[PDB]
Structure formats: structure tokens, C-alpha cells
Design a protein around this ligand. Structure first.
Ligand SMILES: Cc1nc(N)nc(-c2cc(C3CCOCC3)cnc2Nc2cnc(Cl)c(NS(C)(=O)=O)c2)n1
Length: 834
């Protein structure tokens, strides 16, 4: 009867039904509320295309991928059983057209990946992958997968503007189980980041319980309170210092004003952090500080039923023209609002326009909704993700404003959703209420596409497993997905969850036995792994970072604990698919100890940078490997085949000291033919510039060379994204490959500069998008770096306000700063330990 709910809880990692940490029914209200959204998307989804989940794109084929096609022909090798043909086809041919040259369907050899539907083969991502990598398109004639397998289980389920009183709250007192300075309570009325009104209490001596019993009367009137308005209670001591915080929505999910007694358990500090805005309370009731308060005045918020001077218009357009991180003066705001209707014609003015609204004022908000009612330009405008994300950040608490951002997301094809999914999932932390347009948007795009749904699951589970601030919310959303994804997915998820759970235990036990690394622990590992092969590891499970790949039995011989501070497991799996015409294992690094969430964000931005470069016909051969945060301080990473670190190349031919020549003839040896050395050297030139530019922008380029890797075919790539300085790594050994020895300029070194610039200016063309991603990253992902100082790095990095020519100068100077420092920093890392 209810075994399903116990099944669901073990996949989510949290008990949705639990009510030990709440003071209203918003979570439960959101469960019931999310049912329609699910049911509708389940109802309407095409079952045949659902089971096969064809991953396709409407984007044009890039210039560099065309060049790898001769005479509008591509080869496709179909397999029968032991036999195989090799058809010729044109790019624009549909899989129907191709199949009718021989019901069946064309499945990719090795992977649960299908080539079906009315798109030209040039528009499948697998075909674009084969062409990019220079591999041939193998596929096995197969039966379509039964949609009966994807079945879903059968489911069962006084006006506010008429009160001229000033809002007030009573602070009864504060209490803390365990604790010579004094302390007070600060009360703020807030809308987004904006503080509409503020009041303090008189200081008292800080004992383990402190009672005040005061009313704090605020200047704001009850009618002027906007929907979303948080009451934010903070505790300072003292030269002041913040110790604890907590928030309470003054208008609930049913539009009623909040009333009565509350005992709220607070969050402790150790700055803009997403955690500071949460409606959640601390679930640790035994140790947390608690504040007690009283609200009393049932009141309900209603639901809404010339030419301009030459000079002033330019003043307006300069304001619209600035970056998202450029502040607005009171002068700027009054202008933007006065000329309201001129500003509405420009989609780009929107973030700044709605940051000019006085939200603590009933009539202004009313006027603002009349503005949103009259939006023809916005609804017509071409989708701009940069502008869309802006309206979903921490500055916008108004549901109606945020809703026009989601409206624009509706038009994104699936491929583009994948590109932004993680960030949109992190953007849910900025919503005031648990139920929201954004939550529903993610829910249904995941219910429509198995690939989206897969990564949606893992991104949610990641955040539920290591955030007490938002797990309650993310949990509710996950359940809502799992109840729609289909029995075949829930099966697949349950195997993935088990495998990682079995592997965690092994890691806990192993870690204890160490203090470098012995080989008795290597056998102890291989012992327990062999013991897991028959109890109770399933025959097959999907690779969470690459769900097409089913991985089966273990190659116990090749598995080993890594020579590293955290003792990660270096595992290797056989493939479960007989039809895979290869024999390379699946290599996974399983890591317990650290939080991989920051590693995801960075790698996901790397993929966004690629897609940007793609739109300007550029390819810089970045290598963003699979990396999934799977649980509390655990996760999996992809092993890149035929790869080694730049530092280990030094420990061979030198073994403190560094030599220039070494890298070049490491490549020379690993390349058989001369052409392949020359192929592999150019891949190094692209790689290096791409990774140089990309780290400079993100401000993570000054790295230690045991964290830079390279493939035998010359592809460079950074790893592990957890005095005097260098803007990025361009060490003399790299330069040696490029054919410059101190101070020269090779035909290769100049092309490196030629690309570096093209890359940089290309990124610059999407300044706003990158500025807003960076901002969100730091606020939702990295609780270390969150201030004006931190976030404003990228403004400088992308050289806002400068022109295309002067920026080029700026970057080429950064190339020379590196040149001028050689091995100095690299040595200094080594020196500083000693
Ligand atoms: C993505 C990838 N691919 C490959 N081939 N290798 C690695 C990798 C390898 C190695 C050693 C292997 C033995 O030689 C010394 C280095 C260490 N780390 C690697 N990648 C990695 C990336 N990101 C993180 Cl967060 C970590 N975690 S860590 C440094 O093991 O704690 C590892 N990572």
C-alpha cells in the first residue's frame, strides 16, 4: 500500500512526510500543488519518443565540423549480428530515409542511445561527437524499447489594504542551551536584498537566556507590506558582530498576514550568501539558539484585478547600457521610474527598471503590475538567457517579475536546458515560496526528457544531502519528479543509489588503515571488492555522469587506492553491453571526504564557454570531464583515458628542479608517426589557450602543476577546482612545445596569441551572461567567496567598458606577465612546503 513512499525516501535521502521542523503547512501544500503539473506533463508526453530520448539540436553545424566532411557524404556502419554493412548518406538525411535503404530502429553500439525521429542526422549530438573526435559511426539494428516499461504508478491524492496601523512585532526573548559581552536583536523588513525598514532592541548582558518583552514598532504600514516580505531577525554582540540569523515570511502561501507565537531555531554564522535568505529553521533543536516572538495587530492580501528631452534620453540609455554589477544611484532610480514607459520598450532595461520600484509602498507596486500587464515588447523579444537569469537572482523577490523570466525559459530546446540546468536548480534558492514557476518549470522539462530528468535527480540529491538550508524544499520537488519519471527510471535510479552506497562503505573502512600508500591496503581493497562482486552489487548500473553508458562487472586487477591525501578509489568497470565493439574499461574515481558541488559548477561553466565559442565558430578543445556530487561528501569523477599530469612528466626525465625540453619529447615518443606528433602539438595549442583564457576569467588560473593533465594525443586539461602571482599557467615547458626559447615568436606561438584573443573577445561578447553566472555561482555554490570585492573580479577580468582593441592589449600583457616569471611560482610552491 505505502511501500512506495519508503522506496521514494531511500532515493531522495530525506523523509518528505516528516514535520519535526516546520511551523506551517507550506511544504505539504506544495506537494499537493505539484500534482497537476506532473499529471499534465505525464499525460501529454509522447511515449515512443520518451523511451528512446533522442538527443538532438536545432543549432547549425559549426564551420570546423563541416570541414571534416568530404562531398556531402557520411559513413554509417550497421550491424546485423556477426555481419555489418557500411552505407553512404548525406547530412540532411532523416533516420527514416536511411533506414529505408535496407519495425526496427538504429541504436548506437555500446550505449543506450538512439538515432530516431524527424531530424537530419547532422543534428544528432552523437554524430556531432563522432565527427569531432574523428571516429566512425557504428550502430546496431534493434527493436524499439517497450513503452509499457515506462509506465507510471496510479496515484491517489479583512483586506490587507484596509489597515493603516504600523506593523509591529514583540521580541519575547532569546535562549540557548550552551554558551563576557552584551547582545541585541535586530529586526528587518526585507524585499529581496532591499531593507525596507529596521528596528533594534536595547542591549542586554549576554547570558544563556535573555528576555526583553518589547514591542518594536516599524514605520511601515501593514497595507504597504509586499507579498514576499521577510521578517529577518538577527543577533549581534559587542565593534558589532553577527552571531545568528533567521527569517519568517510575513505573508504566507495563502496570502494571509502571519499571526501569533513563534519559537524559531536559528542558523549560526561560521556578505551575500544564498543561505542567509532561507525560510527554513535549524532542525538541530538541541544545540541551536532560539528566538521567541509574538505577532498580533485574519487579514488577507488582495490579488490584482508626451515626448522626452534629448539630454535625458541619453542619460537613460547610458544607465541601460551598463553591466549588471554596476550600481544604481537614487538619481538613476528616480529617472528610470519617472520614465517607466520609455524604459519598458527596451528588454535590457528590465532588471534595472524593477530595481527602481519602491516595494514598501502599496500604490507603487500597483502601478508596477499595470506595467507588467502591458508588455508586448518583452513577450515578442528574442530569448536572452543572460537577461533571463538576471531576473531570477537575489534582487527579485516579486513573483510577477520572476514569472516573466520563467516565461522566456519555456522556449528553450532540451539541449540548451541541459547547458543551464544546474544553475536553474541553484536559482531555486532565491525563490521566496516553496511552490514557484521555476520549480514547476524544472519539474516538467525533466518529466518530458529522460536525460534532463536524470541529471535533475542527481543535482537535487546533491543539494538535499549537504544543505540543511534548502533540503526540505529540494526534497519536495524531487519526490514530485520521481512520481512521474516511470518505473524503468526508478529501477535505474535504485541501482545507482545502491552501487554508490556499497562503494561508500568500502571507502570508510579503507581510509582508517593509512597515515604515503602501502600495497597491503591494495590487497585489503581488492579483498573487499571481490567480496562485493557476489554480495550484493547488481549486474549492471548507469554511469551517473554519462547515463548512456551501462557499466557492469569490476576489473578487480586494475582497481587501486590513489596516492593522495584523501585516499580516493581508482576503480575500473567492464561494460555491460555485449554489442560495444571495443574493450576499454569504464574508469571512475570514487571520492569520499570533500564536497564536489563547487567542482560541478566550474565544469558546467566550462561547457557554457564551449557553447559560446561554438556560436562564433571556435573550438578550443577544453576537456570538462564527468563529475557528479552523489551524496554527503561523496561523488564520482570520470577517468580520462591515456592521460598523465604535467608534474609526473617531470619526475621521469629529471626527478625541485624543472627542465623545458621534457614535455616536448614526452609527446614525441607517445606519438608514433610525425604527423600525429604535429596533430597532437596543435591540439596542445588550442587546449592551452582555451584553458588559459577560461581560468583568467573565472580567476582560478594560478595553479599548481600536479593539477594540470595532458592526454597522449596532446589535449591539455586542468583538474581539481577545490608573494607574487601569475594570471594563469603558461610555463616554459609549454612554450618549448610551441617553439620559443626565452624571447622569440614561433609560427605556433603567434597562433596561440591569435586564438587567445579571439577566445577572449568572444567571451567578452557575452559579458552580462558570464557576470550573472559568476555572481550566482559564488552566492549559491561557494560560501567562502561572497562580497562586492569577490564578485567584482570578473568586471575587471572581462574589462567592462573598454573597447575591443584596448582589451586585446590587456590580455596580451597578461601573456607577457607569465613569460617574465618562468618557473618562479612553480618553484615557490615547492619551496614553501620546505
Ligand atoms: C579527471 C581525471 N582524469 C584522469 N585521468 N586522472 C585524474 C586524476 C588523477 C590523479 C592522480 C593519478 C595518479 O597519478 C597522480 C595523479 C589525481 N586526480 C585526478 N583527478 C581529480 C580531479 N578532481 C578531483 Cl577533486 C580529484 N580529487 S583528488 C585530487 O583525488 O582528491 C581528482 N583525473
Amino acid at each position: 500500500s505505502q511501500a512506495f513512499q519508503r522506496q521514494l525516501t531511500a532515493l531522495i535521502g530525506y523523509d518528505v512526510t516528516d514535520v519535526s521542523n516546520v511551523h506551517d503547512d507550506e511544504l505539504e501544500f506544495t506537494r499537493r500543488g505539484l500534482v497537476t503539473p506532473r499529471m499534465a506533463e505525464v499525460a501529454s508526453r509522447d511515449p515512443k519518443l520518451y523511451a528512446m530520448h533522442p538527443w538532438v539540436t536545432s543549432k547549425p553545424l559549426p564551420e570546423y565540423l563541416w570541414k571534416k566532411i568530404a562531398n556531402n557524404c557520411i559513413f554509417i556502419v550497421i550491424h546485423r549480428s556477426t555481419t555489418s554493412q557500411t552505407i553512404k548518406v548525406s547530412p540532411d538525411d532523416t533516420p527514416g530515409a536511411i533506414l529505408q535503404s535496407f519495425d526496427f530502429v538504429l541504436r548506437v553500439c555500446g550505449r543506450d542511445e538512439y538515432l530516431v525521429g524527424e531530424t537530419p542526422i547532422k543534428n544528432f549530438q552523437w554524430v556531432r561527437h563522432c565527427l569531432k573526435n574523428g571516429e566512425e559511426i557504428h550502430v546496431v539494428l534493434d527493436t524499439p524499447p517497450d513503452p509499457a516499461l515506462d509506465e507510471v504508478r496510479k496515484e491517489e491524492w479583512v483586506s490587507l489594504w484596509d489597515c493603516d496601523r504600523k506593523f509591529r512585532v514583540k521580541i519575547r526573548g532569546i535562549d540557548i542551551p550552551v554558551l563576557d559581552l552584551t547582545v541585541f536583536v535586530e529586526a528587518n523588513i526585507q524585499h529581496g536584498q532591499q531593507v525596507l525598514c529596521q528596528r533594534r532592541t536595547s542591549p542586554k548582558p549576554f547570558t544563556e537566556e535573555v528576555l526583553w518583552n518589547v514591542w518594536l514598532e516599524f514605520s511601515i504600514k501593514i497595507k504597504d507590506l509586499p507579498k514576499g516580505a521577510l521578517l529577518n531577525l538577527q543577533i549581534y554582540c559587542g565593534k558589532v558582530q553577527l552571531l545568528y540569523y533567521v527569517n519568517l515570511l510575513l505573508i504566507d502561501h495563502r496570502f494571509l498576514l502571519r499571526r501569533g507565537e513563534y519559537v524559531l531555531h536559528m542558523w549560526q554564522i561560521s556578505s551575500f550568501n544564498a543561505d542567509k535568505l532561507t525560510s527554513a529553521t535549524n532542525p538541530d533543536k538541541e544545540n541551536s539558539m532560539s528566538i521567541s516572538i509574538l505577532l498580533d495587530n485574519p487579514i488577507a492580501l488582495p490579488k490584482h484585478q508626451a515626448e522626452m528631452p534629448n539630454q535625458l534620453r541619453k542619460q537613460l540609455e547610458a544607465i541601460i547600457a551598463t553591466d549588471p554589477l554596476n550600481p544604481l544611484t537614487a538619481e538613476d532610480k528616480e529617472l528610470l521610474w519617472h520614465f517607466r514607459y520609455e524604459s519598458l520598450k527596451h528588454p535590457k532595461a528590465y532588471p534595472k527598471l524593477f530595481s527602481s520600484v519602491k516595494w514598501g509602498q502599496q500604490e507603487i507596486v500597483a502601478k508596477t503590475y499595470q506595467l507588467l500587464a502591458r508588455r508586448e515588447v518583452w513577450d515578442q523579444s528574442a530569448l536572452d538567457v543572460g537577461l533571463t537569469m538576471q531576473l531570477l537572482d537575489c534582487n527579485f523577490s516579486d513573483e510577477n517579475v520572476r514569472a516573466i523570466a520563467v516565461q522566456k525559459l519555456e522556449s528553450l530546446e532540451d539541449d540548451d536546458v541541459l547547458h543551464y540546468l544546474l544553475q536553474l536548480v541553484q536559482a531555486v534558492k532565491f525563490e521566496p515560496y516553496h511552490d514557484s514557476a521555476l520549480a514547476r518549470f524544472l519539474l516538467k522539462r525533466g518529466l518530458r526528457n529522460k536525460r534532463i530528468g536524470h541529471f535533475l535527480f542527481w543535482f537535487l540529491r546533491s543539494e538535499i544531502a549537504q544543505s540543511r538550508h534548502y533540503q526540505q524544499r529540494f526534497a519536495v520537488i524531487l519526490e514530485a519528479y520521481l512520481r512521474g519519471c516511470g518505473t524503468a527510471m526508478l529501477h535505474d535510479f535504485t541501482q545507482q543509489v545502491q552501487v554508490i552506497e556499497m562503494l561508500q562503505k568500502v571507502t570508510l573502512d579503507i581510509k582508517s588503515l593509512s597515515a604515503d600508500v602501502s600495497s597491503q591496503v591494495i590487497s585489503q581493497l581488492k579483498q573487499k571488492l571481490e567480496n562485493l562482486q557476489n554480495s550484493q552489487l547488481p549486474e549492471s548500473f548507469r554511469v551517473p555522469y554519462d547515463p548512456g553508458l551501462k557499466a557492469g562487472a569490476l576489473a578487480i586487477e586494475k582497481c587501486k587506492v590513489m596516492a593522495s591525501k584523501k585516499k580516493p578509489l581508482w576503480l575500473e568497470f567492464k561494460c555491460a553491453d555485449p554489442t560495444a565493439l571495443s574493450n576499454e574499461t569504464i574508469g571512475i574515481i570514487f571520492k569520499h571526504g570533500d564536497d564536489l558541488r563547487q567542482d560541478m559548477l566550474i565544469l558546467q561553466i566550462l561547457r557554457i564557454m564551449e557553447s559560446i565559442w561554438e556560436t562564433e565558430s571556435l573550438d578550443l578543445c577544453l576537456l570538462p570531464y564527468g563529475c557528479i556530487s552523489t551524496g554527503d561528501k561523496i561523488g564520482m569523477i570520470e577517468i580520462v583515458k591515456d592521460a598523465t599530469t604535467i608534474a609526473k612528466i617531470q619526475q621521469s626525465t629529471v626527478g625541485g628542479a624543472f627542465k623545458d625540453e621534457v614535455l616536448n619529447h614526452w609527446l614525441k615518443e607517445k606519438s608514433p608517426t610525425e604527423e600525429k606528433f604535429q596533430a597532437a602539438v596543435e591540439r596542445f595549442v588550442y587546449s592551452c589557450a582555451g584553458y588559459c583564457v577560461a581560468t583568467f576569467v573565472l580567476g582560478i588560473g594560478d595553479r599548481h602543476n600536479d593539477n594540470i593533465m595532458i592526454t597522449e594525443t596532446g589535449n591539455l586539461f586542468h583538474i581539481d577546482f577545490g608573494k607574487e602571482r601569475v594570471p594563469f599557467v603558461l610555463t616554459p615547458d609549454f612554450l618549448f612545445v610551441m617553439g620559443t626559447s626565452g624571447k622569440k615568436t614561433s609560427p605556433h606561438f603567434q597562433k596561440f596569441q591569435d586564438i587567445c584573443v579571439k577566445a577572449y573577445l568572444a567571451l567578452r561578447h557575452h559579458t552580462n551572461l558570464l557576470i550573472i553566472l559568476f555572481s550566482m555561482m559564488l552566492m549559491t555554490g561557494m560560501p567562502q567567496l561572497t562580497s562586492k570585492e569577490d564578485i567584482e573580479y570578473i568586471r575587471d577580468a572581462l574589462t567592462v567598458g573598454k573597447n575591443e582593441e584596448d582589451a586585446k592589449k590587456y590580455f596580451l600583457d597578461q601573456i607577457e606577465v607569465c613569460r617574465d616569471k618562468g618557473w618562479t611560482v612553480q618553484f615557490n610552491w615547492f619551496l614553501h612546503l620546505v
